Amino acid sequence: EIPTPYVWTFQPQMGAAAGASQDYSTRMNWFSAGPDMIHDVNNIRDAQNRILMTQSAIGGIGSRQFVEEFVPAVYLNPYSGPPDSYPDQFIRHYNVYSNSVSG
Amino acid sequence: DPRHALRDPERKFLCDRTLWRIPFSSNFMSMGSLTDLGQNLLYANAAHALDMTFEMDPINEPTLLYVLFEVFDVARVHQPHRGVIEVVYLRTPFSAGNA
Amino acid sequence: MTFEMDPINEPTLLYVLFEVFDVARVHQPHRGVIEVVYLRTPFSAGNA
Amino acid sequence: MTFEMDPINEPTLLYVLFEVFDVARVHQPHRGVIEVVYLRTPFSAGNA
Amino acid sequence: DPRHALRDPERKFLCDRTLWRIPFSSNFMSMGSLTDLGQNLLYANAAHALD
Amino acid sequence: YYNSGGNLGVLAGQSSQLNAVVDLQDRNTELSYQMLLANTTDRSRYFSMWN
Amino acid sequence: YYNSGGNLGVLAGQSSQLNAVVDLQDRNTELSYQMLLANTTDRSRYFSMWN
Amino acid sequence: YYNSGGNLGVLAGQSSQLNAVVDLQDRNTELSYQMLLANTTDRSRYFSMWN
Amino acid sequence: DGEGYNVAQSNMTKDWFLVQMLANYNIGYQGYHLPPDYKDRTFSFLHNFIP
Amino acid sequence: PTHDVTTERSQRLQLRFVPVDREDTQYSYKTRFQLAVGDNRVLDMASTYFD
Amino acid sequence: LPQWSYMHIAGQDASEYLSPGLVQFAQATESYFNIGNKFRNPTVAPTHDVTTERSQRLQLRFVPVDREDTQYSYKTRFQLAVGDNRVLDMASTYFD
Amino acid sequence: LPQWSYMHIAGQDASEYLSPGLVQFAQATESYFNIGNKFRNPTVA
Amino acid sequence: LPQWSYMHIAGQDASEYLSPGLVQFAQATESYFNIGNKFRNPTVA
Amino acid sequence: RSQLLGNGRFCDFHIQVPQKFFAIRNLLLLPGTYTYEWSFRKDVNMILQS
Amino acid sequence: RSQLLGNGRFCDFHIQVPQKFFAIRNLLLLPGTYTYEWSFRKDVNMILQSTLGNDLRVDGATVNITSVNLYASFFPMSHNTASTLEAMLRNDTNDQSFNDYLSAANMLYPIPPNATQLPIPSRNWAAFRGWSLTRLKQRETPALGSPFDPY
Amino acid sequence: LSAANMLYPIPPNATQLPIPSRNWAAFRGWSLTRLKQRETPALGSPFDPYFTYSGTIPYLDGTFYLSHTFRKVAIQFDSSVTWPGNDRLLTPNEFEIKISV
Amino acid sequence: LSAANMLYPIPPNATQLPIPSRNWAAFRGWSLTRLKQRETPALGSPFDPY
């Protein structure tokens, strides 16, 4: 359905960004509203993911070039896919060459 | 007076019923509720971590560091029918705590 | 409601239990961040 | 960290040294102009 | 103090160099020199008595 | 009571039953009100009604 | 302590600082726990650990 | 003086006026210098000039 | 007192106080607040009201 | 103005509501009112207060 | 974004996001019944052509290039230098 | 209504409102690690 | 990351992040005037 | 405020408490019926000042 | 439970108290640090129980807490799996939800001695589940809400 | 006011006080002061048993008076990028409220 | 040297000495020793009277 996009925190060092997580600092609370309201809220939010959708299609990278890329990506429905194709890269303590491991 | 003995200057100040301010603007000036930096992509695009270090004078008693993360605590009130109040709050940043 | 009971020679109390739905969801977006949302209906926050 | 040491009959101090990267670049654009940029990570500017 | 004896409250007020007002408006508010009631037909048409 | 989920105030339509007052112990209404007055009026005068 | 706003327990992330435990002196945890056990197990046996 | 914000040394261009020496009482230049010498030369010989 | 139709912590009724406020500062239908200074002259109500 | 401002039919200026339920707790007092806004009317909370 | 636009954190003002009818009504009743505080007006600040992104001091400090301490007067000369792409307003200058 | 649907007071069950992946995971770990009590299942009449 | 790369905490060496001209110059003056200590070389593990 | 109540230890007060919650302070309710409830402390150390 | 402590007046106990608050009983926290605080009474008449129900507070009944620790058992789950599990549980679509077993608002109305009739006015704006009730003795019911009952 | 209220304990005689937290978005600014624990009633709970004070509560009425007890404040994002940085202040690595020497 | 210098007091006859601190990143390593308070001048200040 309509979820909430992830946020990418720029890592001052390396420039390889970090793990993305569902934003919550701007969560538009509203469960205390009405029916038509709860209906319109998911509509405007859908338009959001819609914009961030087009805005997405278009060593380490700097900050200035970081805002243009690594934009908030919407991961539609949940884990949906098989245990093979998961977010992975969306995990903070996760590397490519190997599985997520830390000392 | 001629009897005056060698002394030493000492300066200080007081500022009560007031709050120290540090606007989140590029020039510290107020050019609107929604500051310029508060609308910069570097912050709206990716998330960051904050760390503040306050050095203060020692006091012989338990005290507290009252901080105030100025934000936007707004709420819209919608009244469709008779005897029906639907409100929608929204405080950003810090929507519902931090975790 | 009107409860009729046997008389007792000492102060007592009528313990009522308005069965409702005391549910709460727990949301954990990021590391070390717990956001919960309670909701008891009816009797959200007392009666007035 | 928890350091267990032998008792001494006098005030002492535990001198720790968090080895880090205290580097700084020096940029000289024009005549008589020195622009330097320090950077000690971790422990950029104290801990709080 | 513990030596205090039972008393009784007493309220009042003062308002000097002032004049009690009772505007001749339907809502008591001032919406113009010539009030609304002061322009109502019920008064301009027929005469009345005041007490 | 303000900013206390333990005694949060209620204000909803009998038909709606959905409380329109959502408070958080993170907010500070008391102080907020204070500063508000000092910005719209002269916080030096007195007004018994509101003490 | 349970169902007492005076001594409400805390359980929140250091970064969040927002307490996730919202109790009301209207609810009754104690009794609730009792009945719960009598529904999932045989409330006739004994278990020192939990007294 | 070293690692003392009270008597921090200055070294900037007259036109720049922006001091290029940023010290912190957290760092330790003195000791740092010592160890440095014991790694580049034989810290057993003597050299009057630098005492 | 009876019902306590008095306000401002005095012996003045609520009805009268309201009227005076409206006839002087048009204040009453949307909250009671200390009117602006320019409207509080020596011949005003609130200015001389002292409970 | 002499029309489309004030109503001609009877209608109170300030109503008074009584607690439909009140609980006097050892350290708190709670009361609930059924604030009813008659038809063809508009209430500005700012004008409301607890006596 | 639609999140702010809805909450009016940013965007058009009440005199625009409100129905034309209601707007003028308030303007007319700006005497007896007021409803202007009921609607919030967003105030956004500029995000370009105002402040610079590159490093730059806010207030510089200049040292005397020459100073003469006379028996009854003290004279000092400074080389007040205004970097390029900058503008100095004397009013903000003083002698410490 | 959206109020109950969110709190799961009524509506689909855990085996439906949850991500397909997490579902089967619990079913597989129904031996050592259990997480079936962590998700509530609504029962409407 | 760009934070280290700039401070040379990690990345290319002086013989790479420096202008070709300046590089060889130092190599040639490796007798009278030395400028090799003026440029730091990162050593990552 | 002190003298506003009197000089006697015992005193029968009578005050008017306004609404401070922003979400409903300057709100403009429309026709209909609503349940308006609210609690009040009694802790002398919070309602009173010395 | 009595003999579970011993037959002596004095006794150095040591017990394990579980968490009963539904909102966090069966909760499944994820990586990170959290502040977990809680209070504990000391009123002998509430922590202790007697067969006769005599006022322990007056019969020289005293308790003393020396130390309190918090234990927590973690499943030795593979970091690879544990990491995946976390990724999923951090999605709003998979938020955990609990509900007190009793699920009911507790009310208490006084019943004067020898009283027979007892009316109770209240109003619900919605629809609940049902009613449940009994009768208790005031003396045997400690006034909750306050950190201490003197009566 | 529009601001999230936070309270961090300051042990007696303490001088340094670090505070970790992270914002996913952009706010308006900071505002702060200092209050005495004894004069600050623990809110949130319907009753404070350890509140033995009846004087003015700076946390509510806003009668602050300890702003002259601060030395300096250091802000940094991602624990590296100091703010505002860009060599804005005479002391670009922090906000010195007052100097002794 | 490249390292942040820290100093924690060790009361006379003390044996255990805990030290709380937290790093947001990753450094290089630890290095430590022990010094006598009397032989360690309080730096930072332009003068030590003790």
From Swiss-Prot, chain E:
Lineage top rank: taxon: Viruses
Induction comment from the UniProt entry of this chain: Expressed in the late phase of the viral replicative cycle.
Subcellular localization, as worded in the UniProt entry: Virion; Host nucleus
Additional note from the record: All late proteins expressed from the major late promoter are produced by alternative splicing and alternative polyadenylation of the same gene giving rise to non-overlapping ORFs. A leader sequence is present in the N-terminus of all these mRNAs and is recognized by the viral shutoff protein to provide expression although conventional translation via ribosome scanning from the cap has been shut off in the host cell.
Family: Belongs to the adenoviridae hexon protein family.
Assembly description: Homotrimer. Interacts with the capsid vertex protein; this interaction binds the peripentonal hexons to the neighboring penton base. Interacts with the hexon-linking protein; this interaction tethers the hexons surrounding the penton to those situated in the central plate of the facet. Interacts with the hexon-interlacing protein; this interaction lashes the hexons together. Interacts with host dyneins DYNC1LI1 and DYNC1I2; this interaction might be involved in intracellular microtubule-dependent transport of incoming viral capsid.
Function per UniProt: Major capsid protein that self-associates to form 240 hexon trimers, each in the shape of a hexagon, building most of the pseudo T=25 capsid. Assembled into trimeric units with the help of the chaperone shutoff protein. Transported by pre-protein VI to the nucleus where it associates with other structural proteins to form an empty capsid. Might be involved, through its interaction with host dyneins, in the intracellular microtubule-dependent transport of incoming viral capsid to the nucleus.
Name the UniProt record assigns to this protein: Hexon protein
Residues of the full protein shown: 811 to 861 of 911
Curated annotation (Swiss-Prot), chain P:
Induction data: Expressed in the late phase of the viral replicative cycle.
Domain of life: Viruses
Subcellular location: Virion; Host nucleus
Assembly, per entry: Homotrimer. Interacts with the capsid vertex protein; this interaction binds the peripentonal hexons to the neighboring penton base. Interacts with the hexon-linking protein; this interaction tethers the hexons surrounding the penton to those situated in the central plate of the facet. Interacts with the hexon-interlacing protein; this interaction lashes the hexons together. Interacts with host dyneins DYNC1LI1 and DYNC1I2; this interaction might be involved in intracellular microtubule-dependent transport of incoming viral capsid.
Functional description taken from the UniProt entry: Major capsid protein that self-associates to form 240 hexon trimers, each in the shape of a hexagon, building most of the pseudo T=25 capsid. Assembled into trimeric units with the help of the chaperone shutoff protein. Transported by pre-protein VI to the nucleus where it associates with other structural proteins to form an empty capsid. Might be involved, through its interaction with host dyneins, in the intracellular microtubule-dependent transport of incoming viral capsid to the nucleus.
UniProt miscellaneous comment: All late proteins expressed from the major late promoter are produced by alternative splicing and alternative polyadenylation of the same gene giving rise to non-overlapping ORFs. A leader sequence is present in the N-terminus of all these mRNAs and is recognized by the viral shutoff protein to provide expression although conventional translation via ribosome scanning from the cap has been shut off in the host cell.
Protein family: Belongs to the adenoviridae hexon protein family.
Protein name: Hexon protein
GN (gene name): L3
